[PDB]
Design an enzyme around this catalytic site. Structure first.
Site, PDB file in Angstrom:
ATOM      1  CG  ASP A 279      -2.123   1.558   1.081  1.00 54.86           C
ATOM      2  OD1 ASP A 279      -2.438   1.586   0.111  1.00 54.86           O
ATOM      3  OD2 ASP A 279      -2.734   1.279   2.119  1.00 54.86           O
TER       4      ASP A 279
ATOM      5  CG  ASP B 198      -3.537   4.116  -3.312  1.00 59.07           C
ATOM      6  OD1 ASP B 198      -2.833   3.838  -2.411  1.00 59.07           O
ATOM      7  OD2 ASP B 198      -4.318   4.344  -2.684  1.00 59.07           O
TER       8      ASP B 198
HETATM    9  C1  LIG Z   1      -5.734   7.580  -0.113  1.00 59.93           C
HETATM   10  C2  LIG Z   1      -5.934   6.210  -0.839  1.00 59.93           C
HETATM   11  C3  LIG Z   1      -7.323   5.144   0.518  1.00 59.93           C
HETATM   12  C4  LIG Z   1      -7.538   4.388  -0.987  1.00 59.93           C
HETATM   13  C5  LIG Z   1      -8.695   2.842  -0.028  1.00 59.93           C
HETATM   14  O1  LIG Z   1      -9.839   3.477  -0.044  1.00 59.93           O
HETATM   15  N1  LIG Z   1      -7.888   1.834  -0.283  1.00 59.93           N
HETATM   16  C6  LIG Z   1      -8.709   0.493   0.272  1.00 59.93           C
HETATM   17  C7  LIG Z   1      -8.386   0.305   1.261  1.00 59.93           C
HETATM   18  C8  LIG Z   1      -6.688  -0.006   1.612  1.00 59.93           C
HETATM   19  C9  LIG Z   1      -6.204  -0.042   2.784  1.00 59.93           C
HETATM   20  C10 LIG Z   1      -6.115  -1.263   3.742  1.00 59.93           C
HETATM   21  C11 LIG Z   1      -7.726  -1.078   3.576  1.00 59.93           C
HETATM   22  C12 LIG Z   1      -8.879  -1.034   2.081  1.00 59.93           C
HETATM   23  N2  LIG Z   1      -6.052   4.315   0.707  1.00 59.93           N
HETATM   24  C13 LIG Z   1      -5.261   3.428   0.847  1.00 59.93           C
HETATM   25  N3  LIG Z   1      -4.464   3.296   0.019  1.00 59.93           N
HETATM   26  N4  LIG Z   1      -4.775   2.798   2.262  1.00 59.93           N
HETATM   27  C14 LIG Z   1      -5.533   3.066   2.678  1.00 59.93           C
HETATM   28  C15 LIG Z   1      -5.249   2.937   4.830  1.00 59.93           C
HETATM   29  C16 LIG Z   1      -6.797   3.864   4.811  1.00 59.93           C
HETATM   30 CL1  LIG Z   1      -6.796   3.396   6.762  1.00 59.93          CL
HETATM   31  C17 LIG Z   1      -7.496   4.111   4.591  1.00 59.93           C
HETATM   32  C18 LIG Z   1      -7.706   5.008   2.673  1.00 59.93           C
HETATM   33  C19 LIG Z   1      -6.714   4.297   2.179  1.00 59.93           C
END
Ligand SMILES: CC[C@@H](CC(=O)NCC1CCCCC1)n1c(N)nc2cc(Cl)ccc21
Length: 377
Positions: free
Chosen positions: A34, A220
């Site tokens: 991530d 991302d």
């Molecule tokens: C800023 C972009 C968003 C995109 C998103 O919502 N992704 C799905 C998310 C990835 C991390 C685990 C949970 C699902 N995002 C990413 N990449 N990592 C994240 C981690 C959190 Cl606690 C919240 C939003 C995230």
């Protein structure tokens, strides 16, 4: 680097995970790659969705930091206990580092039901680390304790089952073709870049370049779609509609709510345009472009356990938090996260899916003035 090739796995739309080991003795875990966050946060309690979880207490090298962390976002929050432990990557560099670890003890709408990962590797910068920027991210700990160079490169290859490569500490030549072009990281928090120009089949989209980065443009790996600001999304779709006007599609298709199907296995790729994104280059007034094929943004429908044929989902969607270059972009390109030099490199992936007549490209240089003015303040 050959041992690090093909170290990524996942399911369609559920992300890319790498194998990691934590604690003494080593506990094997699947961890989501991530670039959109900065915490090494692993499930540490038996949530029903999880195959595995981290057991703090069974590790003799685990150190309790005696402080909690609470991370809310939109539909949920994840929370837990901060600590440090010995971490290594089996199909990575042959090293062991003591890194920060957030043991998730409670979460709402965080883990995905059906996925094979139990935590996330926040590969971004300290400034977006939680609770604050004094909690050193994993890659920072890695570089500061070892001689592993401060960069990693991602080749996401997308096929239900998906694969990829996370090369830590360098670049593998054989994972890309053509040339690598670099865009400067604007600010060290997310992997923030600047889009200066967009083209649809060569036709300029004619927008104020500040609209393309409103209020932010990030790279991302934790996002599936190419997400664009409302006003940019509107114009791009209107342009894609125009390029493919020989066939009309339901209004819900453009919103990602309806599928479109053709008799297998053809399939009018030609009526769908190529999308060129111009990114700020390394030199003043210099830019370069990345060209994505209709094959990047029309994805074969994830779960069709009822509905066979060919069928497609529109993988460009609207965003209220700026541009997100997700798997739609990243699966088309070998992406180098050169953190040591504050830049991100793009080159045509060796595993991208191309059609019979057109090719994805990374090309330059182009002259673009006032590129700094495309960034939003
Ligand atoms: C800023 C972009 C968003 C995109 C998103 O919502 N992704 C799905 C998310 C990835 C991390 C685990 C949970 C699902 N995002 C990413 N990449 N990592 C994240 C981690 C959190 Cl606690 C919240 C939003 C995230």
């Amino acid at each position: 680097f050959v041992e690090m090739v093909d170290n990524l796995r996942g399911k369609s739309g559920q992300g890319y995970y790498v194998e990691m080991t934590v604690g003494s003795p080593p506990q094997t875990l699947n961890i989501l790659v991530d670039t959109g966050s900065s915490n090494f946060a692993v499930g540490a309690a038996p949530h029903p969705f999880l195959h595995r979880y981290y057991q703090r207490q069974l590790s003799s090298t685990y150190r309790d930091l005696r402080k909690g962390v609470y991370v809310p976002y939109t539909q949920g929050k994840w929370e837990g206990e901060l600590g440090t432990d010995l971490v290594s990557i089996p199909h990575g560099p042959n090293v062991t580092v003591r890194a920060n670890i957030a043991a998730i003890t409670e979460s709402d709408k965080f883990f995905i039901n059906g996925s094979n990962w139990e935590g996330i590797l926040g590969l971004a910068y300290a400034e977006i680390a939680r609770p604050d920027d004094s909690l050193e991210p994993f890659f920072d700990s890695l570089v500061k304790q070892t001689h592993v160079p401060n960069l990693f490169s991602l080749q996401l290859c997308g096929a239900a089952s998906v694969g990829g490569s996370m090369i830590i500490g360098g670049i593998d030549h054989s994972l890309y073709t053509g040339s690598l072009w670099y865009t400067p990281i604007r600010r060290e928090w997310y992997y923030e870049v600047i889009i200066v120009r967009v083209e649809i089949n060569g036709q300029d989209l004619k927008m104020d370049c500040k609209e393309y980065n409103y209020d932010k443009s990030i790279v991302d790996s934790g996002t599936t779609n190419l997400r664009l600001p409302k006003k940019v999304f509107e114009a791009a779709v209107k342009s894609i509609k125009a390029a493919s006007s020989t066939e009309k599609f339901p209004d819900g298709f453009w919103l990602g709510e309806q599928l479109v199907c053709w008799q297998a296995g053809t399939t009018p790729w030609n009526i769908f345009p190529v999308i060129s994104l111009y990114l700020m280059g390394e030199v003043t007034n210099q830019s370069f472009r990345i060209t994505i094929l209709p094959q990047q943004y029309l994805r074969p429908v994830e779960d069709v356990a009822t509905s066979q044929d060919d069928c497609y989902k529109f993988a460009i969607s609207q965003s209220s938090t700026g541009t997100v270059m997700g798997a739609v972009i990243m699966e088309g390109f070998y992406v180098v996260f050169d953190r040591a030099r504050k830049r991100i490199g793009f080159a045509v992936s060796a595993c991208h899916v191309h059609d019979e007549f057109r090719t994805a490209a990374v090309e330059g240089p182009f002259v673009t003035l006032d590129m700094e003015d495309c960034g939003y303040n």
